[PDB]
Design an enzyme around this catalytic site. Structure first.
Site, PDB file in Angstrom:
ATOM      1  N   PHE A 154      25.998  -9.392  23.921  1.00 22.22           N
ATOM      2  CA  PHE A 154      26.825  -8.275  23.492  1.00 22.22           C
ATOM      3  C   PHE A 154      25.994  -6.992  23.417  1.00 22.22           C
ATOM      4  O   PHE A 154      24.989  -6.967  22.755  1.00 22.22           O
ATOM      5  CB  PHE A 154      27.455  -8.573  22.136  1.00 22.22           C
ATOM      6  CG  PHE A 154      28.299  -7.456  21.606  1.00 22.22           C
ATOM      7  CD1 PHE A 154      29.271  -6.883  22.387  1.00 22.22           C
ATOM      8  CD2 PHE A 154      28.103  -6.974  20.346  1.00 22.22           C
ATOM      9  CE1 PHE A 154      30.044  -5.852  21.916  1.00 22.22           C
ATOM     10  CE2 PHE A 154      28.872  -5.945  19.865  1.00 22.22           C
ATOM     11  CZ  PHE A 154      29.845  -5.383  20.648  1.00 22.22           C
ATOM     12  N   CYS A 155      26.426  -5.935  24.088  1.00 21.08           N
ATOM     13  CA  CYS A 155      25.691  -4.680  24.064  1.00 21.08           C
ATOM     14  C   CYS A 155      24.260  -4.879  24.540  1.00 21.08           C
ATOM     15  O   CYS A 155      24.060  -5.511  25.544  1.00 21.08           O
ATOM     16  CB  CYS A 155      25.739  -4.058  22.687  1.00 21.08           C
ATOM     17  SG  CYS A 155      27.344  -3.354  22.366  1.00 21.08           S
ATOM     18  N   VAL A 156      23.280  -4.378  23.801  1.00 24.94           N
ATOM     19  CA  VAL A 156      21.900  -4.559  24.231  1.00 24.94           C
ATOM     20  C   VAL A 156      21.593  -6.051  24.323  1.00 24.94           C
ATOM     21  O   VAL A 156      20.777  -6.442  25.138  1.00 24.94           O
ATOM     22  CB  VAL A 156      20.859  -3.737  23.471  1.00 24.94           C
ATOM     23  CG1 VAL A 156      20.550  -4.364  22.143  1.00 24.94           C
ATOM     24  CG2 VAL A 156      19.611  -3.640  24.316  1.00 24.94           C
ATOM     25  N   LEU A 200      29.460  -9.059  27.236  1.00 26.24           N
ATOM     26  CA  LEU A 200      30.485  -8.215  26.589  1.00 26.24           C
ATOM     27  C   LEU A 200      29.852  -6.832  26.395  1.00 26.24           C
ATOM     28  O   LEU A 200      28.738  -6.707  25.846  1.00 26.24           O
ATOM     29  CB  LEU A 200      30.834  -8.786  25.233  1.00 26.24           C
ATOM     30  CG  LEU A 200      31.424 -10.213  25.210  1.00 26.24           C
ATOM     31  CD1 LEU A 200      31.807 -10.477  23.770  1.00 26.24           C
ATOM     32  CD2 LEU A 200      32.640 -10.302  26.105  1.00 26.24           C
ATOM     33  N   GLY A 210      23.299  -8.266  25.737  1.00 29.36           N
ATOM     34  CA  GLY A 210      23.608  -8.597  27.136  1.00 29.36           C
ATOM     35  C   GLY A 210      22.503  -8.199  28.063  1.00 29.36           C
ATOM     36  O   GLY A 210      22.136  -8.977  28.983  1.00 29.36           O
TER      37      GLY A 210
END
Lengths: 388, 388, 388, 388
Positions: free
Chosen positions: D117-119, D145, D121
């Site tokens: 998720f975000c960083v 995501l 990812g």
């Protein structure tokens, strides 16, 4: 297969007035009582009115009738060769102002509610400003759905902005008054989606085929959008020149229409302004700019989605959302930052507001029109059936 | 008052070949020596070629001739009723590929330099890819001025994106193959500035008048832009469908043209790509996307200003600026962040590059064409004089 | 290697006044005669004043002095721990209003010309509005270079706009008055380029290194931008809250400053407004919005290029261009559509306008200041040399 | 009042592993059976993990656990002074690769599912590419995501692009290799909303107060966003330099990490990519660009609304919508033009896809971890409770 009067534009009603320009429809009540003040709807003349009474499930007319309002609607003539010289002023006087006068006469009320949609909104606003400079105030309230009043940044100018030469000398523009719109004669094909785009056999063929096979644009929209209307040459010239190009309707007193200067702030009645967030035909921030031009109590509502999807969102389907914010800062981004998102259709918000301006309920009429204006034929009427 | 062949399109030359589709012009040398390899210019067929030889002071042709290059140019036929069924393929085979063959024949060279401008660039690129799949490699280098190869984000799609219904069920698109372009017949009016805009009597009248009186768009541009050309219906359908709408020319092997799949990476020659920063007809970032599709050594140059002002910027006037950056990152913003701004015209940068691909200098020809292809009439030729 | 007072900020002059907040510089004449009315320049307090007197070749001060104007300039104190509670009002009263009073006193004139740059422009505008509500009118004219008055669409709001819940119920905002700026104490590092961006050891290190190695951002700019200044906590809070976030300075009477409501229309003097086209710190269209807020005769000029490159463009170099248009429509795109592009610097346009407001020429002063305010030390002064 | 472990981050579980870098949480089953392959979630280290297990009603963890998946999650250490020199590589090796190894060990499976998720990812993608160059393939599938892989047009460059001088001469860039990230030491405060914005006492105070009083940004989001985390200086330098500034992670083989070149196409597993339409932190079109870099079967889904509102949209609330399109053209606008809008949350679409990669169901574990890795303390664990 779609057919106007069989499975599209089927809300029950009658034509109660007609002239060269339009047919006024009056719808049959669907309630035992209705508000004292009726609503007159002025749809666009680019494409046909029925986008507002598309199918029973999706009809704005039906919905408003079902909330207890008497509805009158302007069904525009698809102009013929005799009207190839009709002007913007002719439409304002002989259709918009005329429709108001006839609806007011049938209703017996001192004031009526008015709605404009798209170019209809620009037309009705102009008509009411003309009326106010004549000292007449026939509207209790105005509803502007997806209407442009300030045409800033609609983009028609863009491809020309960086073509000037670099001057090493004092230079001045050409500055001439334009060749008058009245020198043109013609009927030009128009549709909503491609109003600022080509309208030619190849474009219409390629686009229609591509949309059908590669996108989920609905068939009912494509039907309505494909049912083109003709625009008289001077009318089209005026609209293009004074709104999109020169953006003068928003400058108080700049334009003269039907003998009087047009000042939008002179309409001065409670006004409900609506825009759709993902609308690229009428950018929502352009509809919002109406808030800086109009007097009296204003409400702005923003519906989710596209030009047609956002406006034609009946509450029964329980889809989408809309935003409200009572404050009206100058900047639309500031308006949005403070707005609350609400589930579903914006229709109930509007009809609640409309109820407030429409007076007390009384028993519904049993018949159409009045002694002066009796029923001519059943809605949707023959004008809307004419091919361009 | 502008007149083609009297004070516009006056660079001295002759028509050396003609067919139903075009006239090939060859210009008179203005130097004692010229490069071994000539340059063939393929201008757009939307509007006329002369934007490239506009007036003596502003002529790209004259300038290139003066740098010592033999120049050939495709002057397109303004199609008549006999060509109302001409296709994209017909133009590629009978005009673009034909012009290359004739120029190569007259020159006596194994390879020639090629330039495309606007749609000309798209045409010439396609033609060369077709040739490469046939195993033929007639070009030493390609110059693409203000050319779209990847048509992503040109915006024709935008007003339709948010019209889909909200589905509560599995749903699928229509997915059909489109009605073929070959089923159309017609001649549709076209111009560069309004190619994606209306082309009708009222729009042309209103816009032309507004520009003249309220903007500094130059009269020479308005003259050229107003000198419209007809597009055959199937040609126009193909172009609109496969580039702007479906963006398939950039997908290697997707399209079949003149019997072979089109793969742009198969052109494989040194290529000079140019765009103008404030161009809204061909966004500079869209021209830049060509860098991701073509093989061999590429150079990208960005000129300041508009669609026409940026490209038609002769060095003598000492105006504007351009940007260069040898690195070619995927993203145009990254390209710009590293680019150096240089004073004045980009023309000298390009002609220096062109000299590098054009071989050794030799004595200039005394006559036009060759035994097979002799002079027919003086440039600019009669084709360019035909009204739409 | 750059050094303030050795090869940067070297235009000859003296400090003639100082207080906790600033040092007023007065420059040595470079002409035999000068205009009766001097110009006071109020530079930003984010970064140092010297961007306006960067190097002899690129100095705006020197250039104005050379056109025959007496120039005074506010050199801001780089605040220390004693000023960690200084407010927006403190700066308006003790620096901006004070500087005007001292310059007017030394000059012996009833009115002086005033210039603001960046936040300096916002400061000076506020100060003059405060003065006008007190019934005082010390300015003959105002020049606003790259100044924000209306902060709409500066983008700080954007990442928060789509975070609200979807409400199925009537909902209302929090609506509270904010915690006062006076409750903060501190000194916060600031620079122009990263004012709305991080300011931390890692960001400053990474960005500075990347720019130097991968872009043509000039070393002189990087020097100035890297020479940071401290902002008092309450000052910074006020500025951020009332301009960028709530955009209230443009609402007449909304804010109270130094005891009076601020109404920008009350400044009421000829005003020259400048913006740079590719400026992303002060969007040119945001500077243009000043035209809708100010009274009296306004001129708007648009310079080509970036935030610093466009404003610091001395005419001797003969580079770039600028645009002029006497008409001031509400929309900046409409302004641009009608504007004429002119070669080179906009400086001569401005100094010509400034000459018009500055009165008759008379013999230049031989000494700095006056009996009340004598020279303290040589320009650039010690305040500008202080590290943050 | 929000409190981590009392009314936020309360999904039942245990810490089963910890090191200097992180604590691995394993959640208690809520079903009798679970898929053979567990899911490891790697949340961002900018702000804390709990945005993914915010409250029982809004928890993604709980929801996934309830669909029958064993969930492991990386709870990052809020770094202390001993970690002021930790690098991007240290995190990849000692946290991301380590977490995969521990989860795989406890599960007993050859392959596990992974989510970033975000960083997170960006971290997990990098880790898996490092693993693939080592010949290791521990992931059955990847879910990204709101993840940036291609950082083009994130805008940090913009204010610097138009600052170069106009050159009359050949000029070249500086071109230097940057000062190494390893030369920095420090802990820098970070939060998601202001990651590219100031982080200082005044900004945090002004913004927090303004949002609470003038917008409907939810209190739970403001709580999470305000619970800051420290970033080690070299880590922060690396991330900023190689992604946002130089955009190199997307260039196959460009970066070396943990001894091997990083090639994203080497991950090569089914991948589910998600973005939110109104997200300005991770533009949806930037998340979409991942489709051009990754191998194997990809799915892209677009959720309505903002950065947090779009991703944290539990299906029970029946709000919003999402878009799907099986085709993956290069251009995101082309993807959208063909996409179908579906009512409500995208969660069911994803968990259906995830079920497909997770193998057969078997009886749920009764205990946490395994003989090697036993429970240490209850979730949410003490690491997430540490103040920055």
């Amino acid at each position: 297969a779609f057919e106007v009067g069989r499975n599209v534009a089927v809300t029950e009603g009658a034509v109660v007035f007609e002239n060269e320009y339009f047919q006024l429809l009056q719808y049959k009540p669907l309630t035992d009582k209705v508000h004292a003040r009726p609503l007159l709807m002025v749809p666009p003349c680019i494409n046909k009115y029925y986008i507002l009474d598309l199918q029973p499930e999706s009809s704005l007319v039906r919905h408003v009738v079902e909330q207890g309002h008497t509805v009158f609607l302007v069904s525009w003539r698809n102009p013929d060769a005799s009207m190839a010289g009709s002007t913007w002023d002719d439409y304002i006087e002989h259709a918009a102002i005329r429709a108001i006068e006839v609806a007011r006469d049938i209703s017996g009320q001192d004031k009526i509610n008015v709605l404009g949609f798209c170019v209809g909104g620009t037309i009705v606003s102009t008509a009411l400003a003309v009326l106010a400079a004549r000292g007449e105030h026939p509207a209790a309230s105005v509803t502007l759905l997806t209407t442009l009043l300030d045409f800033a940044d609609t983009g028609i100018l863009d491809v020309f902005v960086d073509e000037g030469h670099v001057q090493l000398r004092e230079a001045t523009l050409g500055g001439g008054a334009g060749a008058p719109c009245a020198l043109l004669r013609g009927l030009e094909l128009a549709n909503t989606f491609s109003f600022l785009r080509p309208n030619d056999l190849v474009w219409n063929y390629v686009v229609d085929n591509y949309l059908k096979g590669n996108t989920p644009v609905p068939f009912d929209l494509l039907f309505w959008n494909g049912d083109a209307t003709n625009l008289p040459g001077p009318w089209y010239c005026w609209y293009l020149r004074h709104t999109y190009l020169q953006n003068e309707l928003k400058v108080p007193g700049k334009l003269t229409v039907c003998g009087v200067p047009v000042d939008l702030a002179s309409i001065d009645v409670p006004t409900y302004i609506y825009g759709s967030r993902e609308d690229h035909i009428v950018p929502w921030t352009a509809a919002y700019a109406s808030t800086a031009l109009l007097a009296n109590k204003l409400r702005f509502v923003l519906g989710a989605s596209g030009h047609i999807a956002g406006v034609i969102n009946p509450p029964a389907k329980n889809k989408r959302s809309h935003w409200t914010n009572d404050a009206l800062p100058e900047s639309p981004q500031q308006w949005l930052a403070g707005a609350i998102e609400h589930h579903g259709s914006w229709w109930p918000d509007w009809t609640a507001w409309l109820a407030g301006q429409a007076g007390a309920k009384r028993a519904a009429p049993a018949n159409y029109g009045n002694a002066r204006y009796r029923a001519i034929e059943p809605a949707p009427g023959r004008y809307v059936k004419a091919k361009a």
